[PDB]
Design a protein around this motif. Sequence first.
Motif, mmCIF file in Angstrom:
data_model
loop_
_atom_site.group_PDB
_atom_site.id
_atom_site.type_symbol
_atom_site.label_atom_id
_atom_site.label_comp_id
_atom_site.label_asym_id
_atom_site.label_seq_id
_atom_site.Cartn_x
_atom_site.Cartn_y
_atom_site.Cartn_z
ATOM 1 N N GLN A 277 0.839 -1.193 0.000
ATOM 2 C CA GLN A 277 0.000 0.000 0.000
ATOM 3 C C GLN A 277 0.876 1.245 0.000
ATOM 4 O O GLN A 277 2.041 1.209 0.427
ATOM 5 C CB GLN A 277 -0.968 0.017 1.193
ATOM 6 N N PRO B 254 0.705 5.417 6.067
ATOM 7 C CA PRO B 254 -0.249 4.714 5.204
ATOM 8 C C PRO B 254 -1.691 5.134 5.474
ATOM 9 O O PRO B 254 -1.991 5.812 6.454
ATOM 10 C CB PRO B 254 -0.037 3.230 5.572
ATOM 11 N N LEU C 130 -10.998 1.839 6.374
ATOM 12 C CA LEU C 130 -11.161 0.521 6.960
ATOM 13 C C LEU C 130 -11.599 -0.453 5.883
ATOM 14 O O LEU C 130 -12.485 -0.143 5.098
ATOM 15 C CB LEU C 130 -12.244 0.568 8.025
ATOM 16 N N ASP D 183 -3.418 -9.555 11.106
ATOM 17 C CA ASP D 183 -2.058 -10.031 11.246
ATOM 18 C C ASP D 183 -1.783 -10.968 12.440
ATOM 19 O O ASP D 183 -0.909 -11.800 12.339
ATOM 20 C CB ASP D 183 -1.026 -8.881 11.193
ATOM 21 N N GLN E 70 -13.274 -3.101 6.142
ATOM 22 C CA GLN E 70 -14.664 -3.517 6.332
ATOM 23 C C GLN E 70 -15.703 -2.533 5.757
ATOM 24 O O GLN E 70 -16.855 -2.913 5.523
ATOM 25 C CB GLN E 70 -14.964 -3.829 7.813
HETATM 26 O O1 LIG Z 1 -2.390 1.045 7.070
HETATM 27 C C1 LIG Z 1 -2.669 -0.174 7.590
HETATM 28 C C2 LIG Z 1 -3.114 -0.328 8.942
HETATM 29 C C3 LIG Z 1 -3.331 -1.596 9.391
HETATM 30 N N1 LIG Z 1 -3.144 -2.715 8.571
HETATM 31 C C4 LIG Z 1 -3.464 -4.076 9.102
HETATM 32 O O2 LIG Z 1 -4.850 -4.258 9.377
HETATM 33 C C5 LIG Z 1 -4.935 -4.857 10.668
HETATM 34 C C6 LIG Z 1 -4.896 -3.550 11.516
HETATM 35 O O3 LIG Z 1 -5.876 -3.595 12.456
HETATM 36 P P1 LIG Z 1 -5.435 -3.074 13.942
HETATM 37 O O4 LIG Z 1 -4.983 -4.368 14.683
HETATM 38 O O5 LIG Z 1 -4.376 -2.012 13.951
HETATM 39 O O6 LIG Z 1 -6.733 -2.631 14.638
HETATM 40 P P2 LIG Z 1 -7.938 -1.733 14.069
HETATM 41 O O7 LIG Z 1 -8.013 -0.813 15.321
HETATM 42 O O8 LIG Z 1 -7.433 -1.205 12.768
HETATM 43 O O9 LIG Z 1 -9.306 -2.514 14.046
HETATM 44 C C7 LIG Z 1 -9.752 -3.559 13.226
HETATM 45 O O10 LIG Z 1 -9.561 -4.764 13.957
HETATM 46 C C8 LIG Z 1 -10.429 -5.142 15.010
HETATM 47 C C9 LIG Z 1 -10.255 -6.653 15.434
HETATM 48 O O11 LIG Z 1 -8.901 -6.841 15.788
HETATM 49 C C10 LIG Z 1 -11.925 -4.803 14.741
HETATM 50 O O12 LIG Z 1 -12.369 -5.700 13.756
HETATM 51 C C11 LIG Z 1 -12.122 -3.369 14.131
HETATM 52 O O13 LIG Z 1 -13.479 -3.152 13.886
HETATM 53 C C12 LIG Z 1 -11.236 -3.236 12.867
HETATM 54 O O14 LIG Z 1 -11.252 -1.943 12.347
HETATM 55 C C13 LIG Z 1 -3.626 -5.658 10.927
HETATM 56 O O15 LIG Z 1 -3.480 -6.921 10.356
HETATM 57 C C14 LIG Z 1 -2.653 -4.557 10.354
HETATM 58 O O16 LIG Z 1 -1.402 -4.996 9.980
HETATM 59 C C15 LIG Z 1 -2.691 -2.478 7.235
HETATM 60 O O17 LIG Z 1 -2.528 -3.494 6.569
HETATM 61 N N2 LIG Z 1 -2.446 -1.176 6.750
#
Ligand SMILES: O=c1ccn([C@@H]2O[C@H](COP(=O)(O)OP(=O)(O)O[C@H]3O[C@H](CO)[C@H](O)[C@H](O)[C@H]3O)[C@@H](O)[C@H]2O)c(=O)[nH]1
Length: 579
Positions: free
Chosen positions: A194, A219, A378, A255, A380
Amino acid sequence: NPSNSNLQALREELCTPGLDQGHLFEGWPETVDECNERQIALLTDLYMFSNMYPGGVAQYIRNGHELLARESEEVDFAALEMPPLIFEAPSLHRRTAERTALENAGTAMLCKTVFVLVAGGLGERLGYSSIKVSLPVETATNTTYLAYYLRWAQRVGGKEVPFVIMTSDDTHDRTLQLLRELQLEVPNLHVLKQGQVFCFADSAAHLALDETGKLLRKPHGHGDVHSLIYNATVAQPLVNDWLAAGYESIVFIQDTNAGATITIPISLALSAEHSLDMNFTCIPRVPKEPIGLLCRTKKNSGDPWLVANVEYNVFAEVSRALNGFSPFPGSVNTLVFKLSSYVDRLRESHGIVPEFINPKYSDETRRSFKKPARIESLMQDIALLFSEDDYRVGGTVFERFSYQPVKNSLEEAAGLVAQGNGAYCAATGEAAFYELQRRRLKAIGLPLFYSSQPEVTVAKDAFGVRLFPIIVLDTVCASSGSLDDLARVFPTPEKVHIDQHSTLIVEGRVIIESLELYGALTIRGPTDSMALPHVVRNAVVRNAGWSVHAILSLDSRLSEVDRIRGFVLKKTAMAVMDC
Ligand SMILES: O=c1ccn([C@@H]2O[C@H](COP(=O)(O)OP(=O)(O)O[C@H]3O[C@H](CO)[C@H](O)[C@H](O)[C@H]3O)[C@@H](O)[C@H]2O)c(=O)[nH]1
């Protein structure tokens, strides 16, 4: 490749009202020729952003204005209620006819599933200076998250399984390094990196510079995965290739959540049973936690209902005003799609999804930033592109235990637990993994008896976990990990007696008919899944085994990996049965 005059044209553009990026060119010559390379680098960097982001930097700036505007008001929905299509998964630890039926149907669907791993994020939180997918799922075998997912995917989807990993500038090189170091051979793996986007110094969307005078970058969130996929080729679009090869589903995972290999088969089966275009993986949510809520929504009074995640932070704000678990299911971001529906929406949107911004303010008063802020997205939120008229979007609710992220440092975790919250730290992640194997194995009749008491305490006596007995079966041994697959490993489980303090590590083609184990044992069989299995009968193994003790507050072999969990396994003795 950009006209020397085209750079001048962009510079003039960025100084116009509504863009107002003059502070970028403070103390500059009139034209392009007179500018040092350090200045042409910036102006070029600004110019190129166009092929990375729709409408280039000018549109980025406008989008920032539009988002920042919106970021002084309270989020509000005209309507919010339970999503119409919600299904409850049967327990992962009860081998009922239903569970059997769903696992079998789901496991067959795994042959026609594309897998996507988003691994561009840093998770700055942990106390771990390397990439999250390089973390071990457990320290008995030290199998990384990366290997764990990939080996599982090749097991259920064949060596040629389609697999996408999204990296970023933060994770990309170390991810390639790990792929090479692990000698992982994945022919249809695609690594898609990305892009970086610019940061805003202020509420007027002025671009932030750093110390050296260059543009600051971060990012754009896990949201970018859909556009990376949309633009990827293999002169044919990647998704066309998948569709032509007969692939039927696509699954997105994060991850550090080993639970996904358990939830995914069930979700596929339920998607098929209930004709779901998109299927959110859920769990009952506790009021405080950093997972979004799956809701049926209407942002404004006239809109159609729209099923989508509402993030925890936003629900926190929507909550305190507009009207032991949350009213709606929690979304854990294992996302399961019907491939054809996924692709249709992808082609319509070019993978572009709604954006947001979430500035961290210095004080409670001013529109003054504690640190520069960038636009996020996001993965989702692609759900917003699936109308209720044309598509069926739903949720599958699993046990909270099936959600095992590693997100928090030990100090945050201690702070979380002190307020009665989920720790989600490395210690509880590793402990949950061992307990999961034990629950699955008991579900097929393995008579495991063991104490529930913790065996080691972490984070200055904040809480304890237990690890033993440790039973880890590799993918050749356990295949997909379904209950039927585990039963193939233990055909007569009532003759297998593994003491609560034991360690059993099994690799390759192995069947264990009968075993008394008081200590640690590794059993290895043919690595070739299609080989004559090594069969263990009437084995009796006793040795000192392994132990665990806390890393004390006080030629050091302790790594960050040990430190972030607060304990170390002592691998004192080990019998090995090979062949
Ligand atoms: O720029 C980015 C940012 C994050 N990631 C990836 O996407 C996931 C990141 O999620 P985070 O663990 O940082 O947590 P979030 O706060 O982003 O939350 C997400 O993860 C949660 C469950 O862990 C809930 O599902 C929530 O609603 C959803 O937005 C990981 O695999 C991370 O490596 C990327 O690939 N690029």
